[PDB]
Design a protein around this ligand. Structure first.
Ligand SMILES: Cc1nn(C)c(C)c1CC(=O)Nc1ccccn1
Length: 330
């Protein structure tokens, strides 16, 4: 089997991407944030504290004839940005782009933090990291991809995120029309439960390529590109007036600037992020100070190849017995 679904930016800055997902019988369609940096499929629901729901579409298990309470099971997740959610668990039928999994753990939120409430466009998350990170207790549950994998034509999914435009998540096949040149594959460590890999280096603008190993994760659920402070300083040094602002919480730059590109290495291959992809707009409405899309990972403990990096590429998440990651230009 295969599946194919369109993923759409939630706003004009590409802060995140939502993909429609059919849950239950009859189908309830929710728009979920596909997140290769986590492993829980959780949704706003009829159980979510009412004051914490503000415009989201909810899953109502009582209206699904295929929903079954997973007795005794609870979940609770915190993300790096300080957001969180928790609740109980049902199993139900879940379909993405024509690909159907029966008995999928659907984690129903009883509580969500303010950042989720405030985002009316995101109805939940669909995790696509390794199932070892799944938070369900006392019986850990599998991701949608893990459940689907044996049935897929090939045990892979791909992320093709757009810049200010829709893109595509595919399951079970590689669309050879969706990228240019060849896909370069690189090793993955699953030891931390992430799609963790090592970039071979970077360049800033038309500058020389610096060969240096940068260990990090391919994370569709993180907006920005978080890299070591040395690398980030080298980038912003090429933008006149750019500075790190503690009060804003990162690098900002004059909105009048033209940003240089940023290149990252995948083996001997190179992915070029255009300057425009690194612009996240005014820090507040009407400001002439703009927020940067490349930020230091120094306070995080891991480097993160988030949407800013991934949307510059066609990315293959290869879930073979030994997983690997593939990157192509597009
Ligand atoms: C790890 C991390 N530290 N910091 C400062 C950031 C911003 C992250 C990434 C992160 O939190 N991503 C996320 C958020 C919500 C849902 C899914 N992914």
């Amino acid at each position: 089997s295969t599946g194919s679904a369109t993923t759409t930016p939630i706003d004009s800055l590409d802060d995140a991407y939502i993909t429609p997902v059919q849950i239950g019988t009859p189908a309830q369609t929710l728009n979920l944030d596909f997140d290769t940096g986590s492993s829980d499929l959780w949704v706003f629901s009829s159980e979510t504290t009412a004051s914490e729901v503000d415009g989201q579409t909810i899953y109502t298990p009582s209206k699904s004839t295929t929903a079954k309470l997973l007795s005794g099971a609870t979940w609770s997740i915190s993300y790096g940005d300080g957001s969180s959610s928790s609740g109980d668990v049902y199993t139900d039928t879940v379909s993405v782009g024509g690909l159907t999994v029966t008995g999928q753990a659907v984690e129903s939120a009883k509580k969500v933090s303010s950042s989720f409430t405030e985002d009316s466009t995101i109805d939940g998350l669909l995790g696509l990291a390794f199932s070892t990170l799944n938070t369900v207790s006392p019986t850990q549950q599998k991701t949608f991809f893990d459940n689907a994998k044996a049935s897929l034509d090939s045990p892979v999914f791909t992320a093709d995120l757009g810049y200010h435009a829709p893109g595509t998540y595919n399951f079970g096949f590689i669309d050879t029309t969706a990228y240019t040149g060849s896909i370069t594959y690189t090793a993955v460590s699953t030891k931390q439960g992430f799609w963790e890999w090592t970039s071979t280096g970077y360049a800033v603008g038309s500058g020389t390529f610096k060969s240096t190993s940068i260990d990090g994760i391919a994370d569709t659920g993180t907006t920005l590109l978080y890299l070591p402070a040395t690398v980030v300083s080298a980038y912003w040094a090429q933008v006149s007036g750019a500075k790190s602002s503690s009060s804003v919480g990162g690098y900002v730059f004059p909105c009048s600037a033209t940003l240089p590109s940023f290149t990252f290495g995948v083996g001997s291959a190179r992915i070029v992020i255009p300057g425009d992809y690194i612009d996240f707009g005014p820090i507040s409405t009407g400001s002439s100070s703009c927020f940067g899309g490349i930020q230091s990972s120094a306070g995080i403990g891991i480097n993160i190849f988030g949407d800013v990096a991934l949307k510059a590429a066609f990315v293959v998440f290869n879930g073979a017995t030994t997983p690997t990651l593939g990157f192509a230009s597009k």
